[PDB]
Every structure is written in structure tokens, then in C-alpha cells.
Amino acid sequence: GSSGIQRTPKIQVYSRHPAENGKSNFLNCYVSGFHPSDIEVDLLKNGERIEKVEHSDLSFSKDWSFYLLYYTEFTPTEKDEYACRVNHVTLSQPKIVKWDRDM
Amino acid sequence: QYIKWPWYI
Amino acid sequence: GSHSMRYFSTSVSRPGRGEPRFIAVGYVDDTQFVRFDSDAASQRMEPRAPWIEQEGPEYWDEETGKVKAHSQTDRENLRIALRYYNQSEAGSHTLQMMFGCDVGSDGRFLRGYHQYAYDGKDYIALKEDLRSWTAADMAAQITKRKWEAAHVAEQQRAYLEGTCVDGLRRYLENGKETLQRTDPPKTHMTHHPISDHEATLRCWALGFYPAEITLTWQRDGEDQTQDTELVETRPAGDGTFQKWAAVVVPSGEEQRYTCHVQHEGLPKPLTLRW
């Protein structure tokens, strides 16, 4: 039941601090520039949805497009991979963005 | 401090 | 420098899945300090910054009242706009409002704002003179004539020059050790081979506050306006921000490129070189 000009979310997956195996950090998924505001965001650990993820209060930019930060505490390791999964009416399928410690 | 008055479209 | 206070409210209908949801957040500069969520349990304006927790029980009662009333008002405004546009009740629609003020270093009023968007595009906005309205389409012109007849602009002008300014200055004082700081960007460059012929140079800015920043690439002193990849400035989650800019360079030419960083926490803009 989308209304108004649709804008696909811009998705970034990253850590609060430069990653260091064994050191506690924060894993972030920032989604921005989207409309309408109905959206689903999850953080994944080895392809599995992380349970206690929190998010910022819905807000928006000057151009009226929305942004949200999803985040959870975590401890990077060598073997573990992380990702962000986003579903939005503009996406034909859920979009999965892998965490790359260099982005 | 929030606005004290909202009004209708 | 100058400072701003802003409140952003979003009302979203969800036909067949409940009543519309209303979310409001308040910011001083790039620091959130309150929120209200019509779906949440407390049904209260809630603190989100250390320096607003000192406000007493009457602040929270009054603020909770004003925001719950706006919540009811904008819920009804979605119904009105549906009627103005003769849109179907099957559709999901959105009403966004933004209001607040800017003040200078001495705390004098610099600008006020009071504006609405419907389904993501301009609906009606208070002009800078705080006396007249800009209406985006024929539905908003109905609202504009209504608000002209009820002198709404006089009330918003009074809020913007009075209460909005007083609150911002007060918040700036109580959170001075947090709001009047700047954190300069920590900067570095990374290098990522693409093939045997090309590598990505990425220029990083981390841990800065406020969020405003400019990163640009140059090749032999000339701007790389369009071969540069730039990401949206993003929160670290700790109250600082991050951004990077990337340029694709032919292997062996890395040293022709410079990255340039402008941030208000810097005394002079930076130049970085691989």
C-alpha cells in the first residue's frame, strides 16, 4: 500500500571501532535515504538472525527521507562473519549486505 | 520544548 | 558557532494492521535528547541524552502532554488529507512534521521552521518571515486558507522566537560539556587492489562531531568530482560520526591522488596522501 515517490534504502554495515578479534565492539547497520518508512532490518551472525538487536528512533533528513541505525554489541573473531538483512517495498527480495571490516 | 499548539489540516 | 533545535514527527497509517503510529524525536544539533512512540508502553516523552534527565517531573508532564496532543492532531490530519485528495483508505500514507529554531553563538534567534510533508514530499511550510505559508498543491492551499483565517502563523512565530529559543539556550547550558564540544576527525587511508591494473584508495574520517564534513579527492591538484565514491555520513553509535570517500586509481599512480578533509573541529583543512 506504498504511497509517494519510492526511494530504495542505502545500506551500510560497519563496526563502531576498527575491528580487533576478541575485543568487544558494536556492529552497526545504518539504512538511509528511503521512503516509505516501513522497513525490516536484522543483523546476522553466520547467516543467523541476532536476537537482541536495538535500533534508533525513526527520524528523517532535510529531504524528508528516513534513516535508522540498527546495532548490537559483539566481539569480532577470525571465523565469524556478520551481515545486515533489509526488506523494503522497493526491494524485490531481501537484501543481504556482508560486513567487510574495510568499509 | 515541544510546540504548545497543533492545528488541523 | 551556531546551534539548532529540531523536532521530527512521523505519522504512518497501516490499514488493516492497527491505528496509525506516531513517532517524534527531538535533537539539539546532531544529538538526540527526547523521543515519543505511540506504540510504546510508557506513553510518555522519554529522555535520550544525559543532560535532559535533570529536568523535573513537571517538564516531563508538560512535554508528554504537548506531544500526545500533536499525536492525536496528526492522526486526524491523515484522515483530512485522505479526504482532500480523495485517496482510498486501502493506501498507507505518511505525514511528517519538522519544527525548531537556530540560534547564534550569543544565542540570538537566527531562523525558525514549521513544516509538513505528506507521503514524502512538501505539503505546507512556514516561510522565513514567520508570517506566511508556502502551499505545495491544491490540497495544501485549503489548509493554507484555513491557517490564515485562524492566525496560526502568529502562534508559531511566538513559539519559535520565544519558547523554542529559550529551550535551546537552556539545553545548551545544561549540556554544555557535551553539546558545545567538537571532536575533530581521525583520518587515514586504506588501499585495496582490484586487479593487477587498478586499486581502490579509501580516505577515512572517524570519530568526529558534529556530523557536517567534506571529503574530496584530487588528482594532481584537480578535483575528481565524478570518479569518487562517497558514502552517506553515518553514526558510530557513541555520539560521533564516520564517512569515507573512495577513488579507483591505476596501479602505480597512487601518489598522484590527495584526499582533503574539512571539518569545523579542524583548525586547518587536512591533506592526506598515500
Numbering used by the authors:
A (entry chain B): -3 to 99
B (entry chain C): 1 to 9
C (entry chain A): 1 to 274
Q: What does the literature reporting this entry say, word for word?
A:
One of the selected peptides, Pep#3(QYI), efficiently induced SARS-CoV-2 cross-reactive CD8+ T cells in HLA-A24+ UHDs. Intriguingly, Pep#3(QYI) exhibited high sequence homology with other coronaviruses, including four types of seasonal coronaviruses. Although electron densities of the peptide backbones were observed, those of some side chains were poor, particularly, Lys4 for three peptides, Trp5 and 7 for CoV2 and 229E, and Pro6 for HKU1. The conformation of these peptide backbones overlapped well. Of the nine positions, the side chains at positions P2, P3, P6, and P9 were involved in the HLA-A*24:02•peptide interactions at the bottom of the binding pocket. In contrast, the side chains at positions P1, P4, P5, P7, and P8 were directed to the solvent region and oriented differently in the complex structures. The obtained data on the HLA-A*24:02•peptide complex structures imply that the side chains at positions P1, P4, P5, P7, and P8 interact with the TCR.
Furthermore, to elucidate the molecular basis of cross-reactive TCRα/β recognition between SARS-CoV-2 and seasonal coronaviruses, we examined the structure of SARS-CoV-2 peptides and the relevant peptides of seasonal coronaviruses bound to the HLA-A*24:02 molecule. The crystal structures of HLA-A*24:02 and three peptides, namely, SARS-CoV-2, 229E, and HKU1, were determined. Overall, we found that the potential of cross-reactivity may depend on the interaction between TCR and the structure of specific HLA, i.e., HLA- A*24:02.
